[PDB]
Amino acid sequence: KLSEQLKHCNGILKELLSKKHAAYAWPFYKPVDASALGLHDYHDIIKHPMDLSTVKRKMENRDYRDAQEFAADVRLMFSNCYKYNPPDHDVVAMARKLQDVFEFRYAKMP
Amino acid sequence: SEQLKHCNGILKELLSKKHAAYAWPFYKPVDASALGLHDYHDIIKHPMDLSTVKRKMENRDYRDAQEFAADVRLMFSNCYKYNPPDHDVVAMARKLQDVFEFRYAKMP
Amino acid sequence: KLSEQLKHCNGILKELLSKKHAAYAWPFYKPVDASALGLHDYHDIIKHPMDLSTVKRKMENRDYRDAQEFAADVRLMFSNCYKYNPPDHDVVAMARKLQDVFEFRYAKMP
Amino acid sequence: SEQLKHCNGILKELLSKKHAAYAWPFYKPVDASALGLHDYHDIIKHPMDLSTVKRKMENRDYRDAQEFAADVRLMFSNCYKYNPPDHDVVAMARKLQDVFEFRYAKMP
Ligand SMILES: Cc1cc(F)cc(C)c1Oc1ccc(C(C)(C)O)cc1-c1cn(C)c(=O)c2cc(-c3cnc(C4CCCC4)[nH]3)oc12
Ligand SMILES: Cc1cc(F)cc(C)c1Oc1ccc(C(C)(C)O)cc1-c1cn(C)c(=O)c2cc(-c3cnc(C4CCCC4)[nH]3)oc12
Ligand SMILES: Cc1cc(F)cc(C)c1Oc1ccc(C(C)(C)O)cc1-c1cn(C)c(=O)c2cc(-c3cnc(C4CCCC4)[nH]3)oc12
Numbered sequence: 471k472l473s474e475q476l477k478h479c480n481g482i483l484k485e486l487l488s489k490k491h492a493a494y495a496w497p498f499y500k501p502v503d504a505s506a507l508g509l510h511d512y513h514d515i516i517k518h519p520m521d522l523s524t525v526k527r528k529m530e531n532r533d534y535r536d537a538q539e540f541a542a543d544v545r546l547m548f549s550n551c552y553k554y555n556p557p558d559h560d561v562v563a564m565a566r567k568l569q570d571v572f573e574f575r576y577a578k579m580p
Numbered sequence: 581s582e583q584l585k586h587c588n589g590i591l592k593e594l595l596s597k598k599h600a601a602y603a604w605p606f607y608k609p610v611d612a613s614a615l616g617l618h619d620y621h622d623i624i625k626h627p628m629d630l631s632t633v634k635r636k637m638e639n640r641d642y643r644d645a646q647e648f649a650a651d652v653r654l655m656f657s658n659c660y661k662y663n664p665p666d667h668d669v670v671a672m673a674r675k676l677q678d679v680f681e682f683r684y685a686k687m688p
Numbered sequence: 689k690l691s692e693q694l695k696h697c698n699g700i701l702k703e704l705l706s707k708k709h710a711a712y713a714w715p716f717y718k719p720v721d722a723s724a725l726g727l728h729d730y731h732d733i734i735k736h737p738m739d740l741s742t743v744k745r746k747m748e749n750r751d752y753r754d755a756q757e758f759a760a761d762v763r764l765m766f767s768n769c770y771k772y773n774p775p776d777h778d779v780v781a782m783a784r785k786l787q788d789v790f791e792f793r794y795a796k797m798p
Numbered sequence: 799s800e801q802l803k804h805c806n807g808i809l810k811e812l813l814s815k816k817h818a819a820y821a822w823p824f825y826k827p828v829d830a831s832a833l834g835l836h837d838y839h840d841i842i843k844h845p846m847d848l849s850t851v852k853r854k855m856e857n858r859d860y861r862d863a864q865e866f867a868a869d870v871r872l873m874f875s876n877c878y879k880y881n882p883p884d885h886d887v888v889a890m891a892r893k894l895q896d897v898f899e900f901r902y903a904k905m906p
C-alpha cells in the first residue's frame with residue numbers, strides 16, 4: 471500500500487546518490503564537517519542537520535512511515551543549506567541542482 | 581501572525597515584477613480546457629497557483645508557515661508531475677522555486 | 689551542568705573510538721549493513737539499530753539532553769548485538785569487551 | 799507482567815549455582831566495615847545487590863522490565879565506580895554482567 475511508496479522513495483535516494491549527479495550531490499553525502507571547514511556557528515544555526523547518509527540509515531531502519539516523511543528530511547537537508555549560506559556560494563548552486571532532480575523524481579511517483 | 585507575516589512577504593516577493601519572466605505561468609490556475617490539456621485534472625488531483633495562495637492568505641486561512649509551504653510546493657510538484665522535463669515551464673518552475681526555498685529557509 | 693556530563697560523555701565516545709579498542713570496536717563504528725550481508729531478518733528482529741557513528745552524529749548535533757540518554761543508546765547498540773546473535777559468534781565477545789570499557793568509564797563520571 | 803516473569807527467570811539464573819564463582823560478591827551488601835573501607839558509603843550513595851533486587855521482585859515493586867534492569871545495572875555500575883579496573887571484583891562483575899545483559903537482550 472505505502473510500502474510501494476517507500477520502495478519508490480528508495481529508488482529516488484539511489485538516483486540522488488548515483489555517480490551521474492556526483493558533481494553537485496557530493497556535499498550532501500555526509501554530514502557537514504563543521505570542524506574541518508572552521509565553522510564555529512554551524513550547529514548554533516542548524517538545529518536539525520540532515521544529509522543523504524542519514525536519510526539512507528533511516529530508510530534501512532524503516533524509520534519513515536510514508537513518502538511525505540522521506541521528502542521532509544530531504545527538504546530539510548536543502549533548507550539547512552539555504553539557511554546557513556549566502557546565495558552566491560557554490561554549495562547553494564549545487565543544492566539547487568540536486569533539489570531539481572529530487573523534486574522532479576518525487577513528483578512522478580504514484 | 582508573526583511567522584505568516586514573513587510568508588506574506590515571500591508571496592509578495594514571488595509576485596513581484598522582478599521574477600515575472602518565470603513566475604507568470606503560476607499566477608492563475610492552469611487553463612487546461614483552453615490549452616486542450618484534457619488529461620490535466622486526471623493527473624493533477626489538487627491544482628494550485630499563486631492567486632489561490634493569495635486568496636487563502638488574504639482570508640487568514642494558513643495556520644502556520646508549514647501549511648503555506650505545502651501549498652507552494654504543491655504548485656511546483658504539480659508542474660513537475662504533469663510535464664516532461666525538457667518543457668520551458670519546468671525550467672521556469674525551478675527558477676521560481678529557488679527563489680521560494682531560499683527565502684523560506686531564512687525565516688526568523 | 690548537563691553540558692559538563694555531556695562533555696564527559698563525549699570523552700567516553702572518544703575513548704570508545706580510539707585505536708586501543710579497534711580490535712573489538714570496529715563492528716560498531718558503522719551501522720550493521722544488513723542488506724549487504726544478506727541478513728533479511730535483521731531489521732525485523734532489531735526495531736531500533738545503533739552504532740557509534742550514529743551516537744557521534746547525535747552528540748555533534750546536540751540531540752542528547754543528558755548522560756542517561758547517551759548511555760541508553762550505547763546500551764541499545766550492545767543489546768541489539770546480544771539479541772540478534774548466538775552467544776558463541778565472535779561479535780558477541782567483541783561487544784562485551786567494548787561494553788566493559790564503556791560501563792566502567794560511564795561509572796566513573798560525577 | 800509477561801516480561802516481569804522473564805526477568806524473574808533472569809534473576810533466578812544470576813543467583814544459580816552455575817555462576818557462584820563470580821556472583822558471590824553480589825549476593826548481599828558490601829560489608830564496608832569488615833573490608834576496611836572508610837569511604838564506600840560516601841562514594842556509593844545507592845547500594846544494590848542481588849538480594850535487594852530479589853525482594854523487590856517478590857514485593858512486586860518493579861513496574862516493568864526496565865526498572866528491573868536499572869537496578870541490576872546500578873549494582874554493577876557501583877562496583878565499577880568504586881573500584882580500580884584491575885580489581886578481581888571488577889572482573890567478576892563483568893562475568894556476571896555478561897550473563898545479565900545477554901538474557902535481558904533475549905526478552906520477547
Ligand atoms: C560545496 C562547497 C564548495 C566550496 F567551494 C567550499 C565549500 C565549503 C563547499 O561546501 C562543503 C565542502 C566540504 C564539506 C565537507 C566534505 C567537509 O563536509 C561540506 C561542504 C558543505 C556542505 N553543505 C551542505 C553546506 O551547507 C555547506 C556550507 C558550507 C559553508 C562553508 N563555508 C561557509 C561560509 C562561507 C562564508 C559564509 C558561510 N558555508 O560548506 C558546506
Ligand atoms: C509556460 C508556457 C510556455 C510556453 F512556451 C507554452 C506554454 C503552453 C506554457 O504554459 C502555459 C501557458 C499559459 C497558461 C495559462 C495562462 C493558459 O494558464 C498556462 C501554462 C501552463 C502553466 N503550467 C503551470 C503548466 O504546468 C503548464 C503546462 C502546459 C502545457 C501545455 N502543453 C503541455 C504538454 C506538452 C506535452 C506534454 C505537456 N503542457 O502549460 C502550462
Ligand atoms: C564482527 C564480525 C566478524 C566476522 F568474522 C564476520 C562478521 C560478519 C562480523 O560482523 C560484521 C561484519 C561487517 C559489518 C559491516 C561493516 C558490514 O557493517 C557488520 C558486522 C556485524 C556487526 N554487528 C554489530 C553484528 O551484530 C553483526 C552480526 C553479523 C552477522 C553476520 N552473519 C550473522 C548470522 C550468521 C548465522 C548466525 C548469525 N550475523 O554481522 C554483524
Ligand SMILES: Cc1cc(F)cc(C)c1Oc1ccc(C(C)(C)O)cc1-c1cn(C)c(=O)c2cc(-c3cnc(C4CCCC4)[nH]3)oc12
Nearest residue numbers: 823824827828829832833876877880881882885886887890
Ligand atoms: C571479590 C573480592 C575479591 C578480593 F580478592 C577482595 C575483595 C575485597 C573482593 O570483594 C569483596 C569481598 C567480600 C565482600 C563481602 C563478603 C565482605 O561483602 C565484598 C566484596 C566486594 C563486593 N563489591 C560489589 C564491591 O564492589 C567491592 C569492592 C571491594 C573492595 C574492597 N577493597 C577494594 C580496594 C579497591 C581500591 C580500594 C581497596 N575494593 O570489595 C567489594
